[PDB]
From a paper:
Complex I (NADH:ubiquinone (UQ) oxidoreductase) is the first and the largest enzyme of the respiratory chain, catalysing the transfer of two electrons from NADH to UQ, coupled to the translocation of four protons across the bacterial or inner mitochondrial membrane. In bacterial complex I the 14 “core” subunits, necessary and sufficient for complex I function, are shared equally between the peripheral and membrane arms, together forming an L-shaped molecule. All known co-factors of complex I reside in the PA: the primary electron acceptor flavin-mononucleotide (FMN) is connected by the redox chain of seven Fe–S clusters to the quinone-binding site (Q-site) at the interface with the membrane domain.
The binding of NADH relies on stacking and polar interactions. The nicotinamide ring is located in the inner region of the pocket, establishing a stacking interaction with FMN flavin ring while polar contacts with charged residues K2021 (suffix indicates subunit) and E1851 stabilize the diphosphate moiety. The adenosine ring is stabilized by stacking interactions with F701 and F2051. Binding of NADH per se had no major effect on the structure of complex I, as the crystal structure of the CXINADH shows a very high level of structural similarity to the crystal structure of the native state, CXIINT. However, this is true only after relatively short incubation times with NADH of up to about 30 min. Since at least three NADH oxidation cycles are required to fully reduce the redox chain in complex I33 and the rate of NADH diffusion into crystals during soaking is limited (probably at least to the scale of minutes), it is possible that these structures represent a partially reduced complex, where NADH is bound, but FMN and some of the reducible clusters in the chain are still oxidized. Importantly most regions around the Q-site show marginal changes in the CXINADH structure, with the exception of the key H384 flipping after extended incubation with NADH. In contrast to our original expectations, NADH binding and subsequent reduction of the enzyme does not lead to large conformational changes apart from flipping of H384 upon extended soaking, which likely plays a role in regulating Q access into the deep end of the cavity.
Residue numbers in the entry:
A (entry chain A): 1 to 117
B (entry chain N): 1 to 427
C (entry chain 6): 16 to 181
D (entry chain H): 2 to 354
E (entry chain 4): 26 to 205
F (entry chain J): 1 to 160
G (entry chain K): 1 to 95
Write the structure that this text describes.
């Protein structure tokens, strides 16, 4: 375990990091020519259409993220067994092995089906 | 040791579908359901609990009914997507877990596990199927959020998430209400009834069969563990049955009318919750499952997308046995002697009167008498003049299933003192 | 704030911008190959501060017109100049770009200074890699306020600072 | 933090500010060293200019960085445009204080580390996820779908391998039994250099760090030469500087974490010096990694997804289950040493076919 | 996604515009769009002397120029019947293969760098530097060399050319074998 | 306590108001991520330390990441298209939101509990034996639920 | 106790969202908010009643992830070819 003071120290860490980041952004913003132009503000690639008018992006990234949320839940379940391992013995090992095998069946299903799609 | 059978078949099939044709996967699913049903029966009178998983007569009866519904609805599903079978398996297992525990949180996990594959099975991709799936999923997640805050306030009124705790005053009543919201939504009780007509109308007919049988069965299995106060029960019954019958009077399509009718029938089943007899409700749900699976198997033989009431007409001339079984089903759901619906209805009303709720019972009886209008307008329509209608007279599969359902209905209606002796511990 | 408004700060930032010249090539013709050769292991413009090479124009201060500028490209390259951060510099590399060169015809821009404000001109065909380094050092001392013309005038630090874009 | 004290809040703030400005100076001079090391790799030589050793060139670079017209592009989200670099930098700086640079009190009195949380790897994991957050958010806010697609590739790949990081980190937790880095380092003090026990998982950790923009997917992407990357291509003066800064801090954070976790975080069997061994192992990993930067090709993000998803992660979880059996039964501690040595001999002999 | 791969971006060498019809990660079809380098050799050559055009011929393919030099010279010779000395033909094939080595070096360097690793660009290009110096010996120019003539080559080789050639010819086999 | 507790609660409720009020889907999701950070801090304040770290990792780090991936694949940020507004439902909706809290407020009003327990920090060290054990059945049910969810989503998208 | 009242208020806010929102995804977000409010109530009552509510909320996280995955698949399938995600755009099924 660890004392709660470390977490207020963590809050202080975040405070310093955020303060320095905002300071750097102020330095960047205040020191500059500031001559806005119409084409300068235009996104990119010579008049219009870097990508332009395109249909919705591939669902492949949705599947990537969904796979990831499910397997991160898997890992969040695997860690409490990782800390207390010798105490849970073969019973806990067997439970974690069956759980892992269920979600590995899910992985093997999505793999033999694949997502190149 | 039945849940192990279900899990083994599901997990193995998940991969075997890559090497097995969807038909072979269908045979495998059917074998698994029949084996699970047989394992349940051989354990009749052998309650078995390992963890929060606890098998009593309720688990046994309701999971038997759910397995029956799953077998029947799998018989019709012939799509070449083995997934379209896998999901069914899940729901069964899921519903099993729903009736097999008192743990509120495992109850939530079981609810989600049995409900999610239904959302995906409802996709014939017909534009109405998408709308149905969307309403279903959104309202179901809303009800799951309510049920979860109810389990939380239950944990607040008592140190455990298991039902039966002593219970506080306002906080325990409030937790009970937040659980009852989700449970009545799942059981299609009003004023949580809105989703049922749209979902039954949109989903493919055999899936609606599976739903209207097994989902309601497992929902009442979970309700029986709750000690719902009489005021909430009376309000639910009144509103549900009234709206069910009345809105069914206005229905022009068979599936929507049958969904409102099932809302009314959940209202009726909500009477046995007065005592939680688990014998009255087990009997009622046995008869209801048989009759409704029969009716929806016929409707699937007519049309999976949508069936108007006129399509039912001329059915006797088309197929005599089918018209006869449809008449049997309409009357049994009307709860008319000498059919078993009368015995289930009476048992629920006897539980209600034993609890001492009279006016509610009278209003239920008046609404049931009103129901006879459309119950006959459906049952008697079989004999009418055949109009233009698609008719697929099934394989011997669905014929035999419908015949067995009607035969069991009449057999247990005529001599109910056959199985009713064994609905308790199982002598 | 434009690198100005303090006697020490403007010399400091001129030092910084001069040794922080980030060349953004716009490779057009055989001039561009002699610029790419100014990156190999004999003569690398990778010391004075020009190692990194950001293809994006939002990220580089020196724009090197290396090759013949055909008219069909004139607006596109043009917009890359408009889409650059303001402290930006433009070099015209080679004969075809600086003047019309030998291709004195219908197709080629006869001075790239037409579409973009050119800082330094560097003749040659192609200008020797060491000559391109000479021009970037020329531009280095130009942005330091250390550059004078033949007529005695001092040249301002940034060309493209004096133009009404439109 | 069972046996370790807690510095005052003012001392924590002082150490934090010092670590942050040191990371600044470190990433500037490590940009110099990478430039020169890549130069030496390709027989050209680097900037013997503004230095002599170049050590005044980052000053000129920073001087360019500000004054460079930090531009707010039209068709961009007014708020996220400025906010996303801040996210990427904030959640990149931290997660470096936990790294122990010495035994307790070896900061000349108070604490080698900043914070020594009981659950460290989880904190690392969360703040590693928030970097991908900043990446794909800046990609979206830019208002350019071209750069958006690159942000999506970046996010997908980084997320997949970031998932693999959990199964990589599982294995040593079984042995040490704590989620604080100091207990793990002390375990490597006692039994010795945990990678000897868990070299394969170490591998899937190492390669995982390659996917975090370090190199060899290299279809992260950078805007160059492919479907342009996200999280840049629209930022000019300081925000672009913050993007590059956070990416390099993440690089050095992995280069520092790799020896801390599996190999010998400073804690040497010989000379037991607090800071010097850790910085030198950082230097070793950095030099090997720049060797990779110079010496190896791209992966195209499809084979990258295949290799991460189908190869690295199942292997990591297999090793985790093996180690879990071994630890719960606790039979020897030798079995893991033997199995990792054998596995390394296997994954070695298959190379020179 | 009808994606507009602009000219020169993203880092598409050889200024060229692409319309990548693209759904997902595949490539449905790339519609190329060229002309951003139209200078008009075919038009300007109609207004320049035959000898002057030898200054216009290398500038089209600026990497392998001596093949253009040879083609133009041979065509005009066949057109008016010139007699090529044998040593002129020997030197012409020497310069042709040498500029071919330099062109191929640049092609493989740009390819490997464009996708892959940035390192192998330098080494090959380093050897290219060596080759370029040879031309400076004889032509005084890196490329765009005006050395060929209607009869043969402009003037004779210096004494110092061949030994540098031998140096490079002996170091090159190991080098090409290393790239391979 | 109350010094920073008031801050955390005010930020929690303000973020909820944003996530339900803002029409920028991206900004709503970002207000919910801020809510998740505030809530992980609250969790740690409640001696649940592992749960706060997973709340950041899974909920914010993973779930709303996929939410954002979906709404970025399908733009949907300007949600007000195909309105059918039902303007009068906007105040009426809030009415129900009032009641759904008030009765909860009634069930929790005048409710005082023994909030004195030495949880020793919600570390996984003690949750391991509870998870694998008394919860192992619920754990395996959850795992099957997730595996089935993967299969469901796969078969649900599955263009073929 | 302020924590439990705040959890109830966040549940109420999610209700307000589910009712007010026009988009499916924002409704799902309000539902997630309701879930997190539930989790906060569970953690408080675990602090009161002995730590079981923590594992409870963990399983709740996993259930939430399952339903999020499946629901987002649904949202994809229904509004891939279709226009604006507005939930009022589908009124085919009428009483
Ligand atoms: S000036 Fe000479 S080297 Fe440059 S583009 Fe023109 S022809 Fe080529």
């Amino acid at each position: 375990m660890a004392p709660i003071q470390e977490y207020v120290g963590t809050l202080i860490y975040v405070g310093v990091a955020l303060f320095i980041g905002v300071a750097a952004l102020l330095v960047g913003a205040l020191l500059g020519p500031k001559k806005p132009g119409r084409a300068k503000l235009m996104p990119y690639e010579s008049g219009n259409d870097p990508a332009g008018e395109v249909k919705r992006f591939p669902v492949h990234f949705y599947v990537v993220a969904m796979l990831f949320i499910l397997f991160d839940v898997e890992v969040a379940f695997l860690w409490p067994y990782a800390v207390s391992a010798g105490g849970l013995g073969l019973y806990g090992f067997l439970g974690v092995l069956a759980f892992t095998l269920l979600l590995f069946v899910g992985f093997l299903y999505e793999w033999w089906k694949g997502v190149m799609r | 040791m039945t849940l192990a059978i279900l899990a083994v078949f599901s997990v193995a099939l998940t991969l075997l579908g890559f090497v097995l044709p969807p038909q072979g996967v269908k045979r495998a699913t059917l074998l698994g359901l029949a084996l699970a049903l047989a394992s349940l029966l051989l354990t009749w009178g052998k309650p078995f609990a390992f963890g929060p998983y606890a098998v009593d007569g309720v688990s046994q009866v309701f999971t038997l009914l759910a397995l029956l519904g799953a077998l029947w609805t799998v018989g019709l599903v012939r799509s070449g997507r083995f997934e379209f079978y896998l999901l069914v398996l899940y729901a069964a297992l899921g519903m099993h877990l729903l009736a097999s525990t008192r743990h509120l949180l495992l109850m939530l996990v079981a609810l989600e596990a049995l409900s999610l594959p239904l959302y995906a099975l409802a996709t014939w991709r017909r534009g109405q199927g998408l709308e149905a799936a969307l309403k279903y999923f959104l309202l179901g997640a809303l009800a799951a959020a309510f049920f979860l805050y109810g389990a939380a306030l239950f944990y607040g009124a008592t140190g455990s998430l298991v039902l039966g705790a002593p219970g506080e005053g306002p906080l325990y009543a409030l937790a009970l209400g937040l659980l009852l919201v989700g449970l009545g939504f799942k059981a299609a009780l009003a004023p949580f009834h809105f989703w049922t007509p749209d979902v039954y109308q949109g989903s493919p007919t055999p899936v609606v069969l599976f739903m209207a049988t097994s989902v309601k069965a497992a929902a009442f299995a979970a309700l029986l563990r709750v000690a719902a106060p009489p005021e909430a029960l009376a309000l639910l019954v009144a509103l549900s049955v009234v709206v069910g019958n009345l809105a069914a009077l206005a229905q022009k399509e068979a599936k929507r009318l049958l969904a409102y009718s099932s809302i009314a029938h959940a209202g009726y089943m909500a009477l046995a919750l007065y005592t939680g007899n688990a014998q009255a409700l087990g009997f009622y749900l046995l008869t209801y499952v048989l009759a409704t699976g029969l009716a929806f198997a016929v409707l699937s033989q007519i049309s999976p997308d949508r069936v108007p009431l006129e399509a039912l007409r001329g059915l006797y001339r088309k197929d005599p046995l089918l018209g006869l079984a449809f008449l049997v089903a309409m009357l049994s759901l009307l709860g008319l002697p000498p059919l078993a619906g009368f015995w289930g209805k009476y048992l629920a009303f006897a539980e209600a009167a034993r609890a001492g709720a009279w006016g509610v019972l009278v209003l239920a009886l008046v609404t049931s008498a009103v129901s006879a209008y459309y119950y006959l307008g459906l049952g008697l329509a079989v004999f009418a003049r055949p109009e233009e209608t698609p008719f697929r007279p099934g394989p011997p599969w669905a014929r035999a299933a419908v015949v067995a359902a009607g035969v069991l209905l009449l057999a247990l209606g005529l001599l109910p003192g056959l199985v009713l002796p064994a609905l308790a511990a199982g002598g | 704030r434009e690198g100005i408004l303090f006697t020490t700060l403007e010399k400091l930032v001129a030092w910084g911008r001069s040794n922080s010249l980030w060349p953004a090539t716009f490779g057009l013709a055989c001039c561009a190959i002699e610029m790419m050769a100014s990156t190999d292991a004999r003569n690398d413009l990778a010391r004075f501060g020009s190692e990194v090479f950001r293809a994006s124009p939002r990220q580089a201060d020196v724009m090197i017109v290396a090759g013949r500028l055909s008219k069909k490209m004139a607006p596109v390259m043009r917009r890359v100049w408009e889409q650059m951060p303001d402290p930006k510099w433009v070099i015209s590399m080679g004969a075809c770009a600086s003047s019309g060169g030998m291709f004195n015809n219908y197709a080629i821009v006869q001075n790239v200074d037409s579409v973009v404000p050119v800082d330094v001109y560097v003749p040659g065909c192609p200008p020797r890699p060491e000559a391109l380094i000479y021009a970037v050092m020329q531009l280095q001392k130009k942005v330091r306020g250390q550059a004078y013309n033949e007529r005695g005038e001092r040249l301002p630090p940034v060309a493209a600072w004096k133009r009404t874009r439109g | 933090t069972w046996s370790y004290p807690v510095d005052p809040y003012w001392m924590v703030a002082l150490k934090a500010l010092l670590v942050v400005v040191g990371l600044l100076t470190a990433f500037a001079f490590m940009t110099l060293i990478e430039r020169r090391l890549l130069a030496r790799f390709q027989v050209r030589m680097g900037p013997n200019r503004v230095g002599p050793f170049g050590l005044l060139q980052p000053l000129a670079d920073a001087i360019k960085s500000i004054f460079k017209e930090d531009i707010v592009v039209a068709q961009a989200d007014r708020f996220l445009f400025v906010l996303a670099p801040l996210i990427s930098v904030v959640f990149a700086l931290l997660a470096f204080g936990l790294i122990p640079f010495g035994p307790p009190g070896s900061f000349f009195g108070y604490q080698p580390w900043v914070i020594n949380l009981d659950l460290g790897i989880l904190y690392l994991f969360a703040v590693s996820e928030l970097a991908v957050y900043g990446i794909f958010l800046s990609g979206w806010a830019s208002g350019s779908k071209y750069s958006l697609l690159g942000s999506l590739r970046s996010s997908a790949s980084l997320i997949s391998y970031e998932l693999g990081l959990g199964l990589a980190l599982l294995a040593p937790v079984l042995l040490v039994g704590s989620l604080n880095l100091n207990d793990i380092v002390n375990w490597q003090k006692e039994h010795g250099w945990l990678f000897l026990y868990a070299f394969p998982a170490f591998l899937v950790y190492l390669i995982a760090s390659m996917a975090e923009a370090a190199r060899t997917p290299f279809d992260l992407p950078e805007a160059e030469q492919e479907l342009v990357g996200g999280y840049h291509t629209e930022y000019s003066s300081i925000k672009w500087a913050l993007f590059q800064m956070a990416e390099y801090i993440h690089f050095i954070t992995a280069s520092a974490l790799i020896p801390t976790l599996f190999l010998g975080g400073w804690t040497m069997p010989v000379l037991e010096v607090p800071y010097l061994w850790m910085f030198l192992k950082i230097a070793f990993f950095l030099f090997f990694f720049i060797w990779i930067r110079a010496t190896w090709f791209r992966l195209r993000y499809d084979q990258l997804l295949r290799f991460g998803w189908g190869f690295l992660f199942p292997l990591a979880l297999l090793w985790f289950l093996v180690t879990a059996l071994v630890v719960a039964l606790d039979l020897p501690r030798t079995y893991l040493l033997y199995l990792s040595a054998l596995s390394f001999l296997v994954l070695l002999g298959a190379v020179l076919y | 996604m009808t994606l507009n791969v602009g000219p020169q971006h993203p880092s598409t060498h050889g200024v060229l515009r692409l319309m990548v019809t693209l759904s997902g990660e595949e490539v449905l079809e790339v519609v190329p769009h060229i002309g951003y380098l139209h200078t008009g050799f075919e038009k300007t050559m109609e207004h320049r002397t035959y000898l002057q055009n030898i200054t216009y011929t290398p500038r089209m393919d600026y990497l392998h120029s001596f093949a253009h030099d040879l083609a133009y010279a041979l065509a005009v010779e066949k057109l008016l019947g010139a007699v090529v000395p044998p040593r002129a033909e020997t030197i012409r094939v020497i310069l042709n293969e040498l500029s071919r080595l330099a062109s191929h070096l640049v092609f493989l360097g740009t390819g490997l760098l464009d996708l892959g690793a940035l390192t192998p660009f330098f080494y090959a290009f380093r050897e290219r530097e060596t080759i370029l110096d040879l031309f400076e010996w004889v032509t005084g120019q890196r490329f765009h060399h005006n050395y060929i003539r209607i009869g043969g080559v402009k003037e004779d080789l210096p004494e110092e050319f061949v030994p540098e050639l031998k140096k490079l010819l002996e170091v090159l086999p190991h080098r090409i074998d290393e790239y391979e | 306590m109350s010094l920073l507790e008031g801050l955390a609660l005010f930020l929690l409720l303000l973020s909820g108001v944003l996530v339900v009020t803002l029409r920028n889907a991206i900004h709503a999701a970002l207000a919910l991520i801020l809510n998740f950070l505030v809530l992980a801090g609250v969790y740690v304040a409640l001696d649940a330390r592992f749960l706060g770290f997973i709340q950041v990792i899974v909920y914010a780090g993973a779930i709303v990441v996929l939410f954002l991936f979906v709404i970025m694949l399908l733009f949907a940020a300007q949600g007000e298209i195909g309105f059918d507004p039902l303007v009068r439902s906007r105040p009426l909706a809030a009415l129900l939101a009032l009641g759904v809290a008030g009765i909860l407020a009634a069930g929790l009003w005048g409710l005082d509990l023994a909030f004195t327990q030495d949880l020793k920090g919600g570390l996984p060290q003690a949750l391991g034996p509870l998870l694998y054990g008394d919860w192992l059945f619920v754990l395996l049910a959850v795992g099957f639920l997730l595996m089935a969810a993967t299969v469901v989503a796969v078969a649900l998208v599955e263009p073929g | 106790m302020s924590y439990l009242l705040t959890s109830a208020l966040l549940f109420a806010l999610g209700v307000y969202g589910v009712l007010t929102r026009r988009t499916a995804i924002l409704v799902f977000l309000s539902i997630e908010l309701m879930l997190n409010a539930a989790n906060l109530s569970l953690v408080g009552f675990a602090r009161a009643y002995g730590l079981d509510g923590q594992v409870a909320a963990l399983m709740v996280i996993a259930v939430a992830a399952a339903e999020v995955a499946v629901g987002l698949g649904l949202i994809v399938a229904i509004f891939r070819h279709r226009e604006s995600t507005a939930v009022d755009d589908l009124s085919e099924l009428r009483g």
